[PDB]
Design a protein around this ligand. Structure first.
Ligand SMILES: O=C([O-])C(=O)[O-]
Ligand SMILES: O=C([O-])C(=O)[O-]
Ligand SMILES: O=C([O-])C(=O)[O-]
Ligand SMILES: O=C([O-])C(=O)[O-]
Ligand SMILES: O=C([O-])C(=O)[O-]
Lengths: 156, 156, 156, 156, 156, 156, 156, 156, 156, 156
């Protein structure tokens, strides 16, 4: 039977414990996700309290991280989502993503309406991924692809 | 000589006037940007107060929208950026992007550090674009590509 | 060509002007919406800056309210939505709906997950209506129906 | 003698304990409410810290969840209600209900005044329920019914 | 037909204009409410944007204050209520009432539940009045009487 | 020697322990205050962290509730007052008193100045009480009397 | 008949006009208050929207500053007090006084209770003054005297 | 070697411990400061986490209060200052000093600039003291003296 | 006679007008400050509402910018300082300086206490300058020098 | 394998423990950083939770402070940065740096755009240092040097 959380702190505390274990075992997110059949972004978000793992996957990562039974069970709960501590990120790495919205949020709205119509790009029927690409001018770039379903707003 | 703004409301008020003129003329952002040599995302962000147009681009869009000289000048000023009224968008369309961060913000941090290292993905050495594509399951999707330079954090 | 707003105050100021004309003509929202082919809640939300009217509906309500051409065009724009002035309503009538969420928000989450699964009830693929009904014990009740599509959150 | 709480964290900590026991026993909210004679939304809200259980219901759910005597006692206390952590939900599922108010809040006020008169729809003489209905286009919908008494505001 | 507002500033702007006219004519709230058949507290609240006046009361105060037709119409609209500028009063006089709640709010909760049961004392089925009384120790006291209906919270 | 607190959580934690003891013993606030010679509103406020009890009353209530010596000492400390968790109550029962201020705050200011003059109604030279009165139309009402000294603001 | 304000912006806008007139006439606060019979801190507070002038003083300062009749009348209104724009001062000069409270606020509470008892030092039965005094080590110091009546909190 | 804190909670938790010890021993702040050579306001502020004691004073108060070695060491650390829990005091006693600034903050700015010039009155080169004195009209008053160095703002 | 402001918007509105004129005239901040004898950071801050110009400098810049007499007078007023619209900058350029404090703020405190002792580095007896320096690895760097007086916090 | 944190409190709690050990050993930050090959500002920032130490440095500071293995491991994790408890510092020493931005933030933006162009001064390709030097007029000054790469914002 599906089970859900209402207080984000239970899974975020579990995330901190997972990260300590992960660091002690010197493991990567890539290798933790390897073998689950699930995308690295999904598995990672789950460890970090923002997705639910199916049972087999929760047992697999729970074996790798030496997690107890309650922790393996918690990983299967649908989370009370929300990773930002207080609305605006304090961390530079997370903040740059918020700033992309402060600069382009209205442009995103305008071009979404122009290309699709009234409505939204979904954050639910949605996936993201992060790719590393060489910068021709030197160095590296991240290409983060946000891929969401258009849901129209129609008169009724 | 470069010129800069310190109060966002000047350019945001100009944006509202631009949008009224744009509606009266039944124009698209695509056609406004046409002939500028500049990406639709960039030109649109400028009209909306979040970027500066070069002089030639400003004259061009100014002619399309019947803008007075002061307005054309304002479009060239470096803006006081920040499109979100009060930190968290109230608009559903803009809000979904913020929600992508509430769900995936810590994952983005985690995978950026794993893939690149300590540091950030830049919001300055940076571009984005919006594409519409059919969903293989029926309907349409937006593919929003965020493309930023990795800047390392190193000890000193 | 679809046209969209980025600052809510343009449409909200128009709403105030609409309400004054509505009051001077002694009109109801029901009679304003009648003949548009559209639900009273949708048309009312449009007048109040939270939905866009199709052209014929905008011309029709604009005739009943004696709106100028700019106002009729503004009603056709996709709005920057958000009717609450500062996150928490001050008005008792609006506030009660917020309180229903303070009391039942977590129950709605829990029961949605149990009945449907992980994911959300859409506020986009969505309609609302307000029905007045006699209370069997005396007096009257409102039955407000929230009717939204279930969108699953699935692993990937 | 009736007993009441003044700090929501006591009952919210209890709710977290209850959800862990519920998950360990693989129980549903429907099974837990069944036999109490109380609506599932009402029982669920109580477990989650937002309603008080009568003594017999508290003993019945307490037995099902293997709760101690203090926990069964706490369930009978009148709570310090307020399920949202910090005013605006972070969780997408709960958030959608808040957005329905950001879009339709002023429409609800407007139509409530037109249909009933000055005053409010109560959040106290009030019930809600969640029903799953098939979407004729495919998929599922939730119909959430908010059913509240009208209380008039009258001159004095 | 009843008419309602959605932006408090329209009626609060009218209140400022009313207060200037009131001062120029050197009138009291007591005189203004006289003849209206309505309590001073209710008529005063309406002038200040927090209640609606019936049409005859509106015309009567409007004649006293020399108000134009749009102002007398505005006074009959159901207001978007909320007199506190930003949640916590800055004014000492108003602030003391807020501080009575900071000190006794949990006591009021506790004693309401003990005396009446779960539920609330209404702010809608409700009246207030202010009386001046001599203090036996010297000086004057305000006796402010809050009088609201108990509405029970019952299981269902 | 008088002793005072600077962090509300010490006394608020004690309040929660008091409420659990109170509930285990199935006591009322009326019976707790009985024999102290002090008003129920004052004694209740002290238990809930918002007043100090004189030593004799502290020992009396401490006996009834089986409190340890440090708890009885804590009850005699002058508190760091402030019962509302985060400025605006979340609990419906407490909230209604805040709404009475959102609706009538400016009327209270206006009528206080008119009846008494510039200055305030004190929240210090002050008492409150709660009475239950039958409603002639059916049901029950609370009459809450706020009774404060007028302190004038005078030029100097 | 006494008159009162409910929106601080009316007297704050008048303050800005007063300051521009004062600057044009190159006047000081000391010379504006001289001849009024009223303390410089009281007169200055009135000009700046935080106190009400008696009629003669209002006319006297109105003549010095060349104010119109509505402005002279406004100065006589009891203000909606609150000089800080948004809770915490942005201006360094005002900020230092807030910082004195962030450092010494709990010490002020502790020593007030120790010296006087439970209760407060009044902000109403209160005066302040600003004196300049040579610093023996060189330079100048301000001695700002806050002088308030003790009001006790007593059991009832 | 000087040592400094970065999280106020460590010293604020110590302040609570000190206050409990102080109450158990029935001590005054005046007695605690006696023999230190230091003003009661400075020593009290240190106990409450807002100042650092020199080693000899820390040992002396530590002996009076039976503090352990870690606590005596903590008292010598330079604090992360800030005694107000969340910007605006909830406590009536502390709040009145904040209200003094809401009423007189702009007057203090204005008169400081007139008497001294552009710049500030220091909160660092600064002392404060609290005196109790009889009110000639009956009762008691606090004279709180804020004594700070004028630091000019000069062009450069 | 020195003159001061109490509402930042008067000078910030002047700043926007200054910036439009500066742009129409294609002027740099460097050339506006040239001839004034004042550092470019100081003159620029004054234009932007954060410092006062001496009379001669105000007339000089007034001449270059074609400002009216009221504007030149306004420039000489001591401002109500605070350039950030709402606590945290929205603009990326400004925001990076805030982030420097989010990363190094506690290190600044720690190292100031270690090097100088308890107290502060002044923001009043203070100057700042901005230099452009070539980056040995290519491109350009800003070296921004913050230079402030240490004021000690000593016992008294 | 690189490891990262998502909740600042883990490393901030570690910082408090580090600071206690540091004080018990009477160490300076200069002495701690000595032998590490890294700048005092960088190593201090890491101890305080705002940078990551390379393994050799972590083991070395770990030996000096007698940290356990988990603690040495934690110091090598990439932090969730953000040292300011709640947006605006409460501590005077940290606050002065924030004030420097309230006074000069728009000047920094203006002069950066003039000297470099549209874009930013990086907080990532960035270093700072704190120097103590005598003030020619007596006393001591801090020279804090902010040194960041210019990254341009260019059309695309
Ligand atoms: O965002 C950036 O690119 C930065 O701060 O360096
Ligand atoms: O985000 C969504 O997909 C929605 O609300 O329908
Ligand atoms: O919500 C209610 O029912 C009320 O306030 O009367
Ligand atoms: O509330 C009060 O009584 C005061 O401030 O004087
Ligand atoms: O407050 C002070 O003394 C300062 O910042 O210079």
């Amino acid at each position: 039977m599906i089970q859900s959380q209402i207080n984000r702190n239970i899974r975020l505390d579990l995330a901190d414990a997972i990260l300590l274990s992960k660091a002690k075992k010197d493991l990567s997110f890539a290798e933790i996700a390897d073998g689950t059949g699930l995308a690295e972004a999904f598995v990672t978000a789950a460890l970090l309290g923002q997705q639910a793992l199916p049972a087999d996957a929760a047992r697999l990562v729970g074996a790798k991280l030496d997690l107890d039974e309650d922790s393996i069970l918690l990983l299967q709960m649908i989370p009370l989502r929300g990773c930002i501590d207080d609305r605006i990120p304090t961390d530079p790495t997370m903040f740059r993503f918020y700033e992309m919205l402060q600069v382009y949020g209205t442009t995103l709205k305008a071009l979404v309406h122009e290309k699709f119509g009234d409505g939204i790009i979904s954050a639910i029927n949605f996936k993201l991924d992060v790719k590393k690409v060489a910068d021709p001018e030197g160095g590296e770039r991240a290409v983060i692809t946000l891929d969401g379903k258009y849901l129209p707003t129609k008169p009724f």
